Design a protein around this ligand. Structure first.
Ligand code: HEM
Ligand code: HEM
Lengths: 379, 81, 106, 22, 62, 48, 111
């Protein structure tokens, strides 16, 4: 080699991971979420830093500071809204990435998947703290309710909850901590994302068919750079449509009411992204049984691999699998609906059956369906 | 490790391709899609559609009840008596 | 005592077969397995014809999945022709493994 | 060679870019 | 014969990427201005007299 | 409650028009390149 | 990479020295082939269906001599620069560039 820019600098060779990388030809449009997933995280960061550049992390000011951001600071209003709606997109994308892992069995990539779960839980921590940042009625009561949930742990819990908060309630100390954690988390996240990339770069992508495509590879640059760009255009279009014409639409919580430490959230609930878990949680009478089964909703993901039963890592050729896959998605939809529901009979009995359904689908139904399909094919 | 010349072995396969500039990006824009979009949607629909349909019934019923039981403030037990 | 019941599974089997669309894509069951360690070895034991043939068919089918087009009704794999050509190869591979595992107890 | 011409258009571009952009 | 509008455009401006960039730089400029002018107008037409622009008359210089 | 109500909706106008020019353009770009692959035809000729 | 790269650098960066040497070479290839009776027959026969009846042999050196490096560079760009190459290979081609890569190999933004 001489004057082959890419290999010359060693650092620049490391970037050919986005150009000369063998990329499956056939490849649904559900493969852009990965790339979108990463634009999201840069978008937040950017935007964020800017918000952090005029935000104050105190009980007295926080709401004011937010409020100042979207009134007297130039373009501080979109940036903030862009930031808030950003985080809806980052989750919307997130669930698309996973739906695909589930469906095409990308999670066959044992190690890559694991880091995916880690990533997924790491964004969840960040979205849970930042919401607290503005210090609105919704944020103030959900932070209390969720961290106190933790006090379900028998021996420690209680002491714990207090250390997290840094007091007996959620006053200054608490708020200042979330700011710092919110801040550095995403930088920690970016390292992970990159380790995630690292492991996948050893095996390549999977595809609709569910068969090796080494016989059919394609240079990433020519194709997929255009595809990614277009997907980003579509991504940005959804974010701005929502930011510019439906600002809070998606932001269910109307609570732009500074948090008064003794009031009534009629129906307090995490934002959309966490309703599944919430629902899941209420269905249990006992509070410790709810937390464990709150944790398991999300962690279940780390066992999928070990639940895979078929010989076709691709659900694509497997109809009974497809049907339950979709169900669980609609079950999951149903669970999010419960999330905004009053605590009552109708919603309780429904949510209860939906939780059962949800673990049944992942724990027992699908696996059986796997074997059945394999027997039908005489495999 | 090199990814491009070490992926696999292929023997006896000829492929024929043309340049972008001699070609058109959008051949039968709508006459291909329509029937392709139609044909795969109709093979999706059965597999896909159902569980969402069901969620909609559950939604509908489920909210009905609620508004009744609660709105029907007399529902549980009557007035006269 | 299977005369009625196991002469009728062929009907669900047949129904299932074409239900899973690989059918349509020019592919064959053998060519749909998950490529793991046993399967790999097995594939590596295929004679040139057999093996070049799987390569062409996945080359045809992935071509199609890229373009979202199904092959012609004329040109589709027919259940009655179930070349389980990997099965032979695959079995031993497994057979050799199990032995190797078993010999390793004590 | 062709560098002057090309460096001249490249210099133009940066110029108009700043001017406008900025 | 003459070159299609495109071919003319092509051989005048796109052969050399230096010219191609230049073009883009200048069109990025010209385009902003018409877009805004047009787009703004459009918008302001839809809310006739709703916006201060339309209403500054009432309390202005007597 | 929302001072930015008017700016915002004007912006929405400019973001919609713009995006109505970039979505169709960039789709083109995408078919320009891909065309090579989508137009491609195969042929298998064993010695066999 | 190196090939197309030599094409490109030819239509944008030809140096008089370089063309000058390639000039001379041509002279020689085109004189030396004409040693012997059979070669000379061919030139004559073919030359009359090709270029018609002419025997441009002596003109050549004149024509060849008209080549200032600018001549060689503008001539070069008509055919090469942004033209769609026609490609053919016979495996193992697994590493043979994608058509789009070959193509963009015909212009010079970088590489
Ligand atoms: C990367 C993952 C991130 C997620 C999921 C995320 C999400 C959020 C959410 C949901 C809010 C609440 C805003 C509201 O609804 O009012 C918020 C606020 C905030 N975020 Fe982020 N953010 C992320 C990254 C960052 C980064 C990297 C920074 C700075 C380095 C940052 C700084 C802030 C600040 C200062 C606020 C408070 C002001 C406001 O409410 O807008 N965030 N974030
Ligand atoms: C910060 C969050 C994440 C980022 C930045 C990210 C980024 C990416 C990127 C860029 C790709 C390559 C393109 C693609 O395959 O779509 C990818 C693939 C993948 N991701 Fe992630 N991802 C994230 C979250 C997750 C999560 C939560 C999971 C699972 C829990 C996951 C599992 C996977 C798997 C299994 C693949 C490869 C599947 C295949 O292509 O065969 N990722 N990811």
């Amino acid at each position: 080699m001489t004057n082959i820019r890419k290999s010359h600098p060693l650092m620049k060779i490391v970037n050919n991971a986005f150009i000369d990388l063998p990329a499956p030809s056939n490849i649904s449009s559900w493969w852009n979420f990965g790339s979108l997933l990463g634009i999201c995280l840069i978008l937040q960061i950017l935007t964020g830093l800017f918000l952090a550049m005029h935000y104050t992390s105190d009980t007295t000011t926080a709401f004011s500071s937010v409020t100042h951001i979207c009134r007297d600071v130039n373009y501080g209003w979109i940036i903030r809204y862009m930031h808030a709606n950003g985080a809806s997109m980052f989750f919307i994308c997130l669930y698309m990435h996973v739906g695909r892992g589930l469906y095409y069995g990308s999670y066959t990539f044992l190690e890559t998947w694991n880091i995916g779960v880690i990533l997924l839980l790491t964004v969840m921590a960040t979205a849970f703290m930042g919401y607290v940042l503005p210090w609105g009625q919704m944020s103030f009561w959900g932070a209390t309710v969720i961290t106190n949930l933790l006090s379900a742990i028998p021996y420690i819990g209680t002491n714990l909850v207090e250390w997290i908060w840094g007091g007996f309630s959620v006053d200054k100390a608490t708020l200042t901590r979330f700011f710092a954690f919110h801040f550095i988390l995403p930088f920690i996240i970016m390292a992970i994302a990159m380790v995630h990339l690292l492991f996948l770069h050893e095996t390549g992508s999977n595809n609709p068919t569910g068969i090796s495509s080494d016989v059919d590879k394609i240079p990433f640059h020519p194709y997929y750079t255009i595809k990614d760009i277009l997907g980003a255009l579509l991504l940005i279009l959804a974010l701005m449509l929502l930011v510019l014409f439906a600002p809070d639409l998606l932001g269910d919580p109307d609570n732009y009411t500074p948090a008064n430490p003794l009031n009534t959230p009629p129906h307090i609930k995490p934002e959309w992204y966490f309703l599944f878990a919430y629902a899941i949680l209420r269905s249990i009478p006992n509070k410790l049984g709810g937390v464990l089964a709150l944790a398991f909703s999300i962690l279940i993901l780390a066992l999928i691999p070990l639940l895979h039963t078929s010989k076709q890592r691709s659900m694509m050729f497997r109809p009974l699998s497809q049907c339950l896959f979709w169900a669980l998605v609609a079950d999951l939809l149903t669970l999010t609906w419960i999330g905004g529901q009053p605590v009552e009979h109708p919603y309780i009995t429904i949510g209860q059956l939906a939780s059962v359904l949800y673990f049944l689908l992942i724990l027992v139904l699908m696996p059986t369906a796997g074997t059945i399909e394999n027997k039908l094919l005489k495999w | 490790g090199r990814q491009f010349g070490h992926l696999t072995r292929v023997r006896h396969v000829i492929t024929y391709s043309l340049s972008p500039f001699e070609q058109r990006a959008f051949p039968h824009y709508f006459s291909k899609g329509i029937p392709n979009v139609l044909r795969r949607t109709r093979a999706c629909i059965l597999r896909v559609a159902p569980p969402f349909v069901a969620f909609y019934l559950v939604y509908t019923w489920g909210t009905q009840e609620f508004e009744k039981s609660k709105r029907k403030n007399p529902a549980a037990y009557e007035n006269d008596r | 005592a299977v005369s009625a019941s196991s002469r009728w599974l062929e009907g669900i089997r047949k129904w299932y077969y074409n239900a899973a669309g690989f059918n349509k894509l020019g592919l064959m069951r053998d060519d749909t397995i998950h490529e793991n360690d046993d399967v790999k070895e097995a594939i590596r034991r295929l004679p040139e014809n057999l093996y070049d043939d799987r390569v062409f068919r996945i080359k045809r089918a992935l071509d199609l999945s890229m373009r979202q087009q199904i092959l012609p009704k004329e040109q589709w794999t027919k259940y009655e022709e179930d070349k389980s050509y990997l099965e032979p190869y695959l079995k031993e591979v497994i057979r050799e493994r199990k032995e190797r595992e078993e010999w390793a107890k004590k | 060679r062709n560098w002057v011409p090309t460096a001249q258009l490249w210099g133009a571009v940066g110029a108009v870019g700043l001017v406008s952009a900025t | 014969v003459a070159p299609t509008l495109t071919a003319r455009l092509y051989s005048l401006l796109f052969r050399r990427t230096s010219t191609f960039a230049l073009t883009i730089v200048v069109g990025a400029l010209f385009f902003e201005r018409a877009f805004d002018q047009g787009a703004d107008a459009i918008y302001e037409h839809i809310n006739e007299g709703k916006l201060w622009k339309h209403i500054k008359h009432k309390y202005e210089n007597k | 409650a929302e001072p930015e109500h008017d700016h915002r909706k004007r912006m929405g106008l400019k973001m919609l028009l713009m995006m109505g020019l970039l979505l169709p353009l960039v789709y083109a770009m995408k078919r320009h390149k891909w065309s090579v692959l989508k137009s491609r035809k195969l042929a298998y000729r064993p010695p066999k | 990479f190196v090939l197309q790269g030599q094409w490109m650098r030819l239509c944008t960066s030809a140096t008089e020295s370089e063309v000058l040497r390639g000039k001379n070479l041509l002279r020689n290839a085109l004189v030396s082939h004409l040693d012997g009776t059979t070669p000379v027959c061919e030139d004559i026969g073919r030359s009359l269906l090709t270029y018609g009846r002419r025997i441009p042999l002596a003109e050549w050196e004149s024509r060849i001599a008209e080549v200032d490096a600018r001549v060689v560079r503008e001539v070069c760009s008509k055919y090469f620069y942004d033209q769609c190459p026609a490609v053919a290979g016979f495996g193992p081609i697994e590493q043979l560039p994608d058509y789009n890569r070959i193509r963009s190999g015909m212009f010079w933004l970088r590489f």
